[PDB]
């Protein structure tokens, strides 16, 4: 599909 | 901040990238570092590798019914993602450590180094007469899992993502660009003196070019018209030397220069992409999938002259043409740079 | 018992070949063996050599007024027919011994070995817009007499004949080919399930393809039309990677798939050359001089992945397209092989 | 000219 | 006599050449010798070099708006003009000594040797449909001053001049060229005998070709028409073998040859450039800037067969065609040379 | 510009 951003935590 | 990621179509293999663009400081480049996330139970016998490649690609990728790119592999690099490799090179990175904290055991980092002798991401403007996309050098990251390096590629296994490499303007101004040309007659001592100068040697896109031209027409002929233009030069080198030059901006003034007279003026010329939506062969900055951009940024060569002929090289020049009566037309040329400044 | 032969235009030099076609068993190839017949009194000082060559040839050979083939010599081999060479490799063959019995002293046998890393004899379909024949890889045997290997070729001395190399279907069936694809909506949990399957993985020319497609449209959109087609892929590799794909057979059914419904059906598609007499770029099996043939047989790669990029590679795939309302079109693909069976 | 078959004998 | 010279656009750097054309005697070539004149105070830190290069150039040089030559560098040579080099190779020449006498201290001689494996200066005829000049192999001398060999070229510093290399006819006549061809029927013993001969094997431009053709039509068919033509063959070899053949002169006679009759005649054919001002692909002799010349002189290969495939090779042949009723047309071919004699 | 001949002397 396409791209996506996500969590980083800490 | 945020972290980009791409996943396999099956949804089992996923790769994480912290950056999408990279820059070079004329002496070093930002290393390409990332982590691949996958549960080994899915494969349980294969091995995971991630590959960096740069290619001279033509056309599009959406299954167009036509002969696709002349796929010349300029440079290819491979790294063994799984089974795990030793510590180098040299340590794990900070962001990779943070992502390993976030995920845990199934996080596998990889490291890459980009050689300094690589071109910049550019893309030629496709022509309306043609079909699909056009030729252009692009960067690409490819991660896949297989028992052997030469195993057949699989759509479900392999994942493809596109990255970009761009340069930024140095903060040190260069010498002032100026030019002059004196042409006499065939027999008489009378001559034609012209001088051209620019405010600076480095400009910014969308900023007008205030060319300063002075004409000393201490001659007998009359200059009919004056033409000022900027020329774009694109060096194409794969195995032979080539250069496709197309004018981008032209301005003409209906000014008559009388004989035995001195005339100096400053003219404004602005390069822009709006008027050249159909001109084939135009060079543009590297795009992600199909998004529009400005004109191709002038890439500056490193201090070492070496060869660097492994792709597309771009430069800009300005020419002023004098329409002299009964022949004797004389034109002057001057090179200059034009590319994006350094952001924060 | 019968035996082919070719003679020089002068009628003095004659070569005998026992076979015109050769086959490979994925591990060994039939050696090219023959005998040249000539009386040494005609030459009395020269030497006789026979050469095997494979070239990427374009156009025709009947003195056409146009730039002829880009004559790339993929591989060339030479053997010293006269003066007589030692016994190898390794012994004389049975048919060569029989022919030496038939003729006598003036019979000179020669031996050749074909390397396993060679392409198959294929020929692209010429276009009506173009002139003469088209591009294609071909085999050729050349026998000539000269004092030196680099001596100028003579029409009266040299003799040219064309041979063919073809593969045959293995008797071991492979895994059953099948494919599936599930696509959901942007927000809702409703999805679109489709599955495609074939009766076998290996078929024969002229035998219909009974594709089994099942559609589970448990969604809200309505599929307008359904398209089923088979695509031919031809890899062109001389020094760059290329691939020219052209559709060969297309079938369309005016079937509407209602939302929240399951629909499965079996459709028939048949590849044939009658409807594509004008489509340029089509790949065909190697011909002798100009005789028509069927579609290009799908050549199978050996067990070793190696490189084998020294010519033209062909493969076939099947694609089924679903025309979904207001966008969202989804297509699935399936590769398969199609080439001649083993005769007796 | 063209090609042709011929005798084998024995 | 007189001595040619060329100067830099700035007027400070000037080079002197005693000859513009050079010839080869099939075993040695006239060395390229000259003297560069410059006052070192202008540079005071740089170094002067002169370079010999041969390239496969296409198009023109007057800043045409189009992709320019595929600049393949067939062979490049460099010599250190300044600082002064040792005495070789081997001594200074006589003309260089005379020029050093004329000028004095600021005269710096240079020496060069042309390898025997080089092509001849030829230029293809540009087409009216195309723009600018056309493709062609050319010689070029380049002198420039810089601190390093890889320094950026400057218009004011570098100077460019064009030289030519041509061959001349040997004084030894060769064997008499003649040809014959006998064609029989499919079943009947009746045949068709034809013989062609020429007065000599080497001619001169503008001198008519008195081809002597004899026809012995002891057959049953009737020859409708007779066609006599001369064909020009141009071998193009850069990395692939190519040959572009175009007819240049054609003559037709409405003569009927009755069955069972013998007919012999001598016909006149003259190659000339007037009637082929528009035929694209024609090969012409090397020009200076744009001046017209005669047809491309037939270059003769050296005694050594070697390879010599590093450019354009040209040859000429004559063909006579017989229009036989109800098919059965037979044509004869014959090679011959045609190029300029030796002047004094 | 163009080419030109010149003096030789002596």
Curated annotation (Swiss-Prot), chains B, C, E:
State the signal peptide span. Answer: none
Q: Which residues carry this modification: Phosphotyrosine?
A: 42
Instruction: Describe, from its UniProt entry, the tissues in which this protein is expressed.
Output: Found in a variety of tissues. The short isoform is the most abundant form in all tissues.
Key words, A-Z: Cell membrane, Coated pit, Cytoplasm, Cytoplasmic vesicle, Hydroxylation, Membrane, Nucleus, Phosphoprotein, Protein transport, Signal transduction inhibitor, Transport, Ubl conjugation
Tell where it localizes. Cytoplasm; Nucleus; Cell membrane; Membrane, Clathrin-coated pit
Mod. after translation: The phosphorylation does not regulate internalization and recycling of ADRB2, interaction with clathrin or AP2B1.
Q: Where is this region: Interaction with TRAF6?
A: 234-344
Task: Report the GO molecular function annotations.
Answer: angiotensin receptor binding; inositol hexakisphosphate binding; phosphatidylinositol binding; phosphatidylinositol-3,4,5-trisphosphate binding
Q: Does the keyword Cytoplasm apply?
A: yes
Question: Where mainly found?
Answer: cytoplasm
Tell me the disulfide pairings in this chain.
Answer: none
Instruction: Tell me what happens on changing residue 227 to Q.
Output: Abolishes phosphoinositide binding and ADRB2 internalization
The effect annotated for residue 231 to Q is: Abolishes phosphoinositide binding and ADRB2 internalization
Q: What protein family does this chain belong to?
A: Belongs to the arrestin family.
Q: How does it assemble?
A: Homooligomer; the self-association is mediated by InsP6-binding. Heterooligomer with ARRB1; the association is mediated by InsP6-binding. Interacts with ADRB2 and CHRM2. Interacts with PDE4A. Interacts with PDE4D. Interacts with MAPK10, MAPK1 and MAPK3. Interacts with DRD2. Interacts with FSHR. Interacts with CLTC. Interacts with HTR2C. Interacts with CRR5. Interacts with CXCR4. Interacts with SRC. Interacts with DUSP16; the interaction is interrupted by stimulation of AGTR1 and activation of MAPK10. Interacts with CHUK; the interaction is enhanced stimulation of ADRB2. Interacts with RELA.
**Record text about domains:** The [DE]-X(1,2)-F-X-X-[FL]-X-X-X-R motif mediates interaction the AP-2 complex subunit AP2B1.
Q: What's this protein's name?
A: Beta-arrestin-2
Q: What is the lineage of its organism?
A: Eukaryota, Metazoa, Chordata, Craniata, Vertebrata
Instruction: Give the encoding gene's name.
Output: ARRB2
Full-sequence portion shown in this chain: 7 to 350 of 420
